[PDB]
Structures are given as structure tokens and as C-alpha cells.
Ligand binder design. Structure first.
Ligand SMILES: Nc1nc2c(ncn2[C@@H]2O[C@H](COP(=O)(O)O[C@H]3[C@@H](O)[C@H](n4ccc(=O)[nH]c4=O)O[C@@H]3CO)[C@H]3CC(O)(O)C[C@H]32)c(=O)[nH]1
Ligand SMILES: [Cl-]
Ligand SMILES: [Cl-]
Length: 395
């Protein structure tokens, strides 16, 4: 009996069902969301949440776009910050605090990210940070310390690739990976409020990756997630979402390590890109459905719900009181990786929250990165094309 089976039956019996549209395709994130829901549904006399898998996150936002066209939104959905911006154009979203959800104790950063014109429109739910995954066996074999600096990391990847006869730094030629290099080379996406894709730090970041491929230390991963490609060739390092944790753990036929990101200097870890999603509540929802969402959101922000969800997945607990929860404490005591994810979460950058940012990051920025990495397009020429297509789109 799967938790989605148990939820179907809970909702079948319920007098009020609040649909939650999500983009977990499976693994620990889908399971942890459904187990959270099963528990919530059991505490409710005939009031239920129905999680509805919509595919991945981009399938989800396309489904929500169609639901606006059709004029039938769910009660709740996962949303990135740029998706929340796009939804506020449609005036589609309920202010969270007006629902009566108490947000004191939520990570102020995570709260900053969902705050539009001073009003909170989302609940931070499954917020991830990039971390450095590494092959502890391979570093130990060659006496290679975990790199604390970008310079050390490049050196370590060169040294290991030469030793193992293959590129040991594995990356997705995508916007998320580029963000790690761009941010830690001093890059910023907004220059006096203008979106800039082709800044000298963007060229530098894309040039570092393209050179890492040419020099034999970086391996572009073009089919599946990094964690789906493990076992094919020597692997030392990736920079990847904390949500990948359980997937790396299950796949890896080596002792997986997690470290904070290499930074400019030893004074501080690199910044990681914040990913994952916020829950939003749609205005179109009935008052009955809204009240279910209010109680579901208070439940999701409870220390225990956060502790269980975060330790199950490798998401970052969004509340102060989650770290004070004994279930969290007992996992952290046994597994140094949860502290390592939380500590990395102090060094956290966000992509722009422009309504068009989802199209830009995949169709424009993502494509330029692929052109440079996969087709050896000149990094500046690739990014200057991206900057023009973005400017066109935003005009
Ligand atoms: N649609 C849309 N997507 C966006 C936006 N900004 C960022 N992203 C995507 O957020 C994913 C990160 O969110 P996160 O919750 O940290 O991690 C995901 C999965 O990535 C990760 N995962 C899943 C399966 C697996 O085998 N391995 C694994 O690591 O687990 C989670 C749940 O599926 C990136 C990944 C991307 O999908 O390639 C593009 C990025 C946006 O604005 N819109
Ligand atoms: Cl699965
Ligand atoms: Cl992608």
C-alpha cells in the first residue's frame, strides 16, 4: 500500500479536499510529501489534502498556466519565486498571513524570497541548497583533501582526472550549475535592475566549464541526473542540489561525501544556489479549501513535520524550531551531512524573481550554456545571443 493509495482513500471519504499540485516525480521527495499528507489527513475530521503529481517543476508550471486558461486552479501548488511573480500578474494568489498562517521563526531569507511588495505570498516548503558531493574513496586513494577554494577544487579535479584517466568533475550544462561558478566569481544577474546574462563574470564562469571539458577534468552530463550516471567512469566531485542527497546515496558504489562549496577563499564557503519550492494558495479556492490550506501550511511549518521532511530528503529545514526538534537532533547526531547542508544554507544566493525567469533560465541561458559546452560555441558569443533573446523577451 503506497501513501498515494492511502491518500486517495482519505480524500474519497473527506467532505473537503484541497488539491496540492507538485513536481516531485518520485524518490524520497515524493514519499516525504505523501507521508506528511497522510499524517495531516489522519489528524483532520473529513478535511484532506490531495497531492497531485504534475510531472517535474516545468510540467507543473505549464499545468498551472493551462489551469488559469481553463479557470480551475488547485487550492495549493509548489512555486518558485519567479512563478509567484508570474502568478501575481494574474492576481491568482492569497496573501499567506491573511490566511492566518504564522510565519515567525521561518528563515528570514526564505521569507524574503516569497515577499512581494512587502506581502508574503508563499510558504517555504522544500528549499534546497547546492552542496559539494564527492567520492570520499577516490579523494582518500590519492591523498586529496576536500577542496575549500575554487583554486583548490580545479587543482583537485585536474590531479584526480590525470590519476584516474577520466574527467572527475561531473556537471549538468545548465543554469543551476552555471550559477555556482557565476556567483562565486563575483557575478550578479541584475545590474541597476537590468537582467544581464553576458557580464564578464558570466563569460568567466562559462569559460571555466568549457576549458574544464577541453582540459579533460570536467564531464558534461547530458542524459539524466548526475546521480543516474554514477558508475560510468571515475567520479570525484559534483555541485548539486541538497535534494539530490537520497538519490546520490542510493546510486553511489563508493562512500559518498558531502561538503560545503568551494569559495573564493578559506574565509567562507562558496555560495550555493537556493532551489526547491514554496507553497502558494490560490484565490479561486473555496473558503472551505482555503481553511484546509491554512491548517496544512501550519502543519508543514511545525518542527516535527520540517524535521521529518528535511531528514528524509536533504532539503533545508525552513524554521528555527525544526533544528530544536529531537527527531532532527537524532538524525544530525548520526549523520554529519545534515549539519553540512544547514551550514551550506547560510551561504545562499537566489536567481532573479522576474515572471519570465523560468523561460529564460531553460530556453535562453540553458541553451547558451549547452551551445558553449556541447557545441564549443564561444562563451561570449553564446551569452551575447542569450542576452539579446532575453532583452527581446522582456521588451
Ligand atoms: N521549472 C522550474 N525549475 C526550476 C526553476 N529554478 C530552478 N529549477 C529547477 O530546480 C531544480 C532543483 O530543485 P530541487 O527541489 O532542489 O531538486 C529536485 C531535483 O532536481 C532533485 N533530483 C530529482 C531526481 C533525481 O534523480 N535527482 C535529483 O537530484 O530532487 C528534487 C525533487 O525532484 C533544478 C534541477 C532542474 O530541474 O534541472 C532545473 C532546476 C524554475 O524557475 N522553474
Ligand atoms: Cl521512485
Ligand atoms: Cl536543464
Amino acid at each position: 500500500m503506497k501513501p498515494e493509495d492511502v491518500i486517495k482513500e482519505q480524500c474519497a471519504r473527506a467532505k473537503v479536499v484541497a488539491e496540492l499540485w507538485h513536481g516531485f516525480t518520485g524518490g524520497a521527495p515524493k514519499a516525504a510529501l505523501e507521508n506528511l499528507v497522510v499524517e495531516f489527513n489522519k489528524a483532520q475530521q473529513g478535511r484532506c489534502v490531495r497531492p497531485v503529481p504534475q510531472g517535474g517543476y516545468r510540467d507543473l508550471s505549464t499545468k498551472i498556466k493551462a489551469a488559469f486558461a481553463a479557470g480551475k486552479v488547485p487550492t495549493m501548488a509548489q512555486a518558485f519565486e519567479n512563478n509567484i511573480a508570474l502568478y501575481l500578474e494574474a492576481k491568482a494568489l492569497l496573501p499567506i498571513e491573511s490566511l492566518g498562517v504564522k510565519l515567525q521563526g521561518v528563515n528570514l531569507t526564505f521569507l524574503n524570497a516569497v515577499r512581494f511588495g512587502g506581502v508574503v505570498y508563499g510558504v517555504p516548503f522544500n528549499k534546497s541548497i547546492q552542496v559539494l558531493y564527492y567520492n570520499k574513496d577516490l579523494l582518500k586513494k590519492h591523498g586529496v583533501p576536500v577542496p575549500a577554494t575554487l583554486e583548490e577544487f580545479v587543482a583537485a579535479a585536474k590531479k584526480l582526472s590525470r590519476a584516474e584517466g577520466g574527467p572527475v568533475y561531473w556537471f549538468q550544462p545548465d543554469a543551476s550549475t552555471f550559477a555556482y561558478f557565476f556567483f562565486n566569481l563575483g557575478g550578479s544577474y541584475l545590474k541597476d535592475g537590468k537582467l544581464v546574462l553576458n557580464s564578464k563574470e558570466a563569460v568567466e564562469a562559462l569559460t571555466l566549464l568549457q576549458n574544464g571539458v577541453k582540459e579533460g577534468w570536467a564531464k558534461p552530463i547530458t542524459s539524466g541526473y548526475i546521480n543516474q550516471n554514477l558508475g560510468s567512469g571515475p567520479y570525484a566531485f559534483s555541485v548539486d542540489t541538497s535534494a539530490g542527497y537520497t538519490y546520490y546515496l542510493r546510486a553511489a558504489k563508493f562512500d559518498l561525501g558531502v561538503a560545503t562549496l568551494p569559495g573564493r577563499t578559506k574565509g567562507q564557503p562558496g555560495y550555493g544556489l537556493v532551489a526547491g519550492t514554496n507553497l502558494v494558495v490560490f484565490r479561486q479556492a473555496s473558503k472551505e479549501e482555503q481553511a484546509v490550506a491554512k491548517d496544512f501550511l501550519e502543519f508543514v511549518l511545525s518542527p516535527r513535520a520540517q524535521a521529518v521532511f528535511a531528514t528524509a530528503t536533504g532539503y533545508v529545514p525552513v524554521t528555527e524550531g525544526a533544528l530544536k526538534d529531537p527527531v532532527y537532533q537524532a538524525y544530525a547526531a548520526e549523520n554529519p551531512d545534515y549539519a553540512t547542508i544547514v551550514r551550506q544554507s547560510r551561504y545562499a544566493k537566489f536567481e532573479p524573481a522576474l515572471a519570465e525567469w523560468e523561460q529564460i533560465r531553460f530556453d535562453i541561458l540553458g541553451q547558451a550554456i549547452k551551445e558553449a559546452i556541447l557545441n564549443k560555441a564561444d562563451p561570449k558569443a553564446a551569452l551575447d545571443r542569450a542576452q539579446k533573446l532575453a532583452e527581446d523577451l522582456l521588451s
